[PDB]
């Protein structure tokens, strides 16, 4: 379920571009055991790329 | 065992890359007790551990500095290992090497791996 919820959130993060969203989604497919950490880094990039 | 790594290139900070490592030589069974990993050699630095995966179980282990950003995986049918690299930063600039051991590594150092790819070069620009 941590895979599943993370996929959805990453999909709808407003401040990632397509290449980033697609790469994080692939990482979730690649290694589901890292789902929480992958979501954490997607969140970090979503925050740092917030529009100014 | 023979290893050929590829996929490195130039990428802008924040971007993604996917490295591949084709395993060759003798034939692999899906449950061979092999371990594959990735090491990287930054400018002015020695080769440093990035990630490893046990071939049989697909159990993974990551260096702290790449957790959440990089994922290692392996496809037995294609006999290939992959490194997905996301949220890239200038300090990820390095030559990346596929590596393998016919067993369980006793350390995270180069000495624990006896088979090596030739390296693929990753450059992360600002």
Numbering used by the authors:
A (entry chain H): 2805 to 2856
B (entry chain A): 2 to 127
How is this structure described in the published paper?
Single-domain antibodies (sdAbs), including camelid-derived nanobodies and human-derived variable heavy domains (VH), have emerged as a transformative class of biologics due to their small size, high stability, and superior tissue penetration. Derived from Staphylococcus aureus, Protein A is a 42 kDa surface protein consisting of five homologous immunoglobulin-binding domains (A–E) and an S region that functions as a signal sequence and cell wall-binding region (XM). It strongly interacts with the CH2-CH3 region within the Fc domain of IgG1, IgG2, and IgG4 and can also bind certain antibody fragments. Using this approach, we successfully reprogrammed multiple human-derived VHs and camelid-derived nanobodies to acquire high Protein A affinity, enabling efficient, tag-free purification via industry-standard Protein A affinity chromatography.
Additionally, we selected the camelid nanobody VHH3, which targets human TNFα, shares low sequence similarity with n501, and does not bind to Protein A, to further evaluate the versatility of our model. We also identified the L90Q mutation in both VHH3-M1 and VHH3-M3. The glutamine at position 90, similar to glycine at position 74 in n501, forms hydrophobic interactions with Protein A. However, its side chain can form hydrogen bonds with the side chains of N92 and R20, which are essential for binding to Protein A. This interaction can draw the side chain of R20 closer to D39 of Protein A domain D. In contrast, leucine at position 90 cannot form hydrogen bonds with N92 and R20, thereby removing the constraint on the side chain of R20. Consequently, the L90Q mutation may restore the interaction between R20 and Protein A. To validate this hypothesis, we resolved the complex structures of VHH3-M1 and VHH3-M3 with Protein A domain D through co-crystallization, achieving resolutions of 1.49 and 2.0 Å, respectively. The structural alignment of VHH3-M3 with VHH3-M1 is highly conserved (0.164 Å), differing only at position 88, which is located outside the binding region and exerts minimal influence on binding affinity. Most notably, residues R20 and N92 not only engage in hydrogen bonding with the side chain of Q90 but also form hydrogen bonds with Protein A in both VHH3-M1 and VHH3-M3, corroborating our initial hypothesis.
